[PDB]
């Protein structure tokens, strides 16, 4: 593997996703694949659909083999059913050889191929235990780690910078994508990339919630989620704190729910507070904080939408937070790394910060229930 050749291997943005070019079958068919750290299947369109240009035609691949079974995957607000097979895949921006992997080819779906997408499948990079129909279906990254002789690590940089593609470095860390220190937080549970959130701070003030409220369902790092998603009680506390700290006198209730845009003539970002998320260090007595500036949560659409949404379920660190950071998914060492992204800059200003260490003596030793 060549990590320098992986720089700028993603196209897209937080609106419609970050996607990787993949070549599938013999002769190769080129697909555009969403990079998804919140799922564990490699699944591609196998039939024509309204919101896609191309699909993988298994009949045109001489190396494709059918496993003889289907899989149905269901999400909140969507689903698909596909045939499960095996074929050879190359990733041209990083590798020089092909690898044998499992592939699901989608023949029916609901709410999956959304309006506006440039991708026609998904690359699930989470752990085997989320794979469907079961964890015996070898995941793409498990196949790649073995067959390509790479370390069990990948890293991601998203350069949309709250509006320039990105990089998926399969097998390691590219030094040219960050400056300063990488801070590591333990993976609490290897399914999603579940990490432990200790504290949220808005404009320098703590929310003063029990730290279990940040982890109750789970806190995860998910490149296939657009917004920062917060459990309802955390969301309401954040909204209250943003409205108190902001130099805008009035926000509508509809602004916070995404029903109304906030509009100005000639930049709103100086009128909003920084938002900080504190993560436990590998030493449990230390934490570090990842900080997003208003640029990452007051999103241009000049009119602006709120870049945070309430969750029925989990606390999700999605693409818009990830647009601030080089994120290292260190599966081998059971940890997630963060460094501030040099590309996370708008109008000459960094849109994110990282700092530490801070003491965890005032917080419980386990914030997951």
């Amino acid at each position: 593997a060549n990590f320098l050749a992986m720089v700028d291997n993603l196209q897209g943005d937080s609106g419609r996703g970050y996607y990787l070019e993949m070549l599938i079958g013999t002769p190769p068919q080129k697909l555009q694949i969403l990079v998804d750290t919140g799922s564990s299947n490699f699944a591609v369109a196998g039939t024509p659909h309204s919101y896609i240009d191309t699909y993988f035609d298994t009949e045109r691949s001489s190396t494709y083999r059918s496993k003889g079974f289907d899989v149905t995957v269901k999400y909140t607000q969507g689903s698909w059913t596909g045939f499960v097979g095996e074929d050879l895949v190359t990733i041209p921006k990083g590798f020089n050889t092909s690898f044998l992997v499992n592939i699901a080819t989608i023949f029916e779906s609901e709410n999956f191929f959304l309006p506006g997408i440039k991708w026609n499948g998904i690359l699930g990079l989470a752990y085997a235990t989320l794979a469907k129909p079961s964890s015996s279906l070898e995941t793409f990254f498990d196949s790649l780690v073995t067959q390509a002789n790479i370390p069990n690590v990948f890293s991601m940089q998203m350069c949309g910078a709250g509006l320039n593609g990105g990089s998926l470095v399969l097998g390691g860390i590219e030094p040219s994508l960050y400056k300063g220190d990488i801070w590591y937080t333990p993976i609490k549970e290897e399914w999603y990339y579940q990490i432990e959130i200790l504290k949220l701070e808005i404009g320098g003030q703590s929310l003063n919630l029990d730290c279990r409220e940040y982890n109750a369902d789970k806190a995860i790092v998910d490149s296939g989620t657009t917004l920062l998603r917060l459990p309802q009680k955390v969301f309401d506390a954040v909204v209250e704190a943003v409205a108190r700290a902001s130099l805008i006198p009035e926000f509508s209730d509809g602004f916070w729910t995404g029903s109304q845009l906030a509009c100005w003539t000639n930049t709103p970002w100086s009128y909003f507070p920084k938002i900080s998320i504190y993560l436990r260090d590998e030493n449990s007595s230390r934490s570090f904080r990842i900080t997003i500036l208003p640029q990452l949560y007051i999103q241009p659409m000049e009119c602006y939408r709120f870049g945070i949404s309430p969750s029925t379920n989990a606390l999700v660190i999605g693409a818009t937070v990830m647009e601030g950071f080089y994120v290292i998914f260190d599966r081998a060492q059971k940890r997630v790394g963060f460094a501030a992204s040099p590309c996370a800059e708008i109008a000459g200003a960094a849109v994110s910060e990282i700092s530490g260490p801070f003491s965890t003596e005032d917080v419980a030793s386990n914030c997951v229930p």
């Epitope: 190396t63 083999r65 496993k67 003889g68 079974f69 095996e86 050879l88 044998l100 992997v101 499992n102 752990y127 085997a128 794979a131 964890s135 015996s136 279906l137 070898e138 995941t139 498990d142 196949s143 073995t146």
Partner: nanobody, 112 residues
Framework: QVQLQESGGGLVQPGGSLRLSCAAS????????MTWVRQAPGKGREWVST????????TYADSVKGRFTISRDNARNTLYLQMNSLKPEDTAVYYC?????RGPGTQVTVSS
């Protein structure tokens, strides 16, 4: 729960041969991609060969092409590696892996 157990290694001279086996249980072997990897002390992990579930698609590292042959018997839940024309630099623990799990491996030593 998944079990992989390799056997068939040994100590051979240069130009010798071995037949490695891996017995599998606790999953549907007939639907599993299977891979052989090798690891020698002080060296990097080295992919050897992969075989698709029906046995028809096989791939090999350049370092072993034309010398080693991967195969499987789905009815017997067994993976094989036929190793010919063995060289000192093939010395390693050889292990089978599938879906992020691995067996403990079998030692291959090639020496005069």
């Amino acid at each position: 729960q998944v079990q992989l157990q390799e056997s068939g290694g040994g100590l051979v001279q240069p130009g010798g041969s071995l037949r490695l086996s891996c017995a599998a249980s606790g999953f549907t072997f007939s639907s599993a991609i299977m891979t052989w990897v090798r690891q020698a002390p002080g060296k990097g992990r080295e992919w050897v060969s992969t075989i698709g579930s029906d046995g028809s698609i096989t791939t090999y590292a350049d370092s072993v092409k034309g010398r080693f042959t991967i195969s499987r018997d789905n009815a017997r839940n067994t993976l094989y590696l036929q190793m010919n024309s063995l060289k000192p630099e093939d010395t390693a623990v050889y292990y089978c892996t599938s879906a992020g799990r691995r067996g403990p491996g079998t030692q291959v030593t090639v020496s005069s």
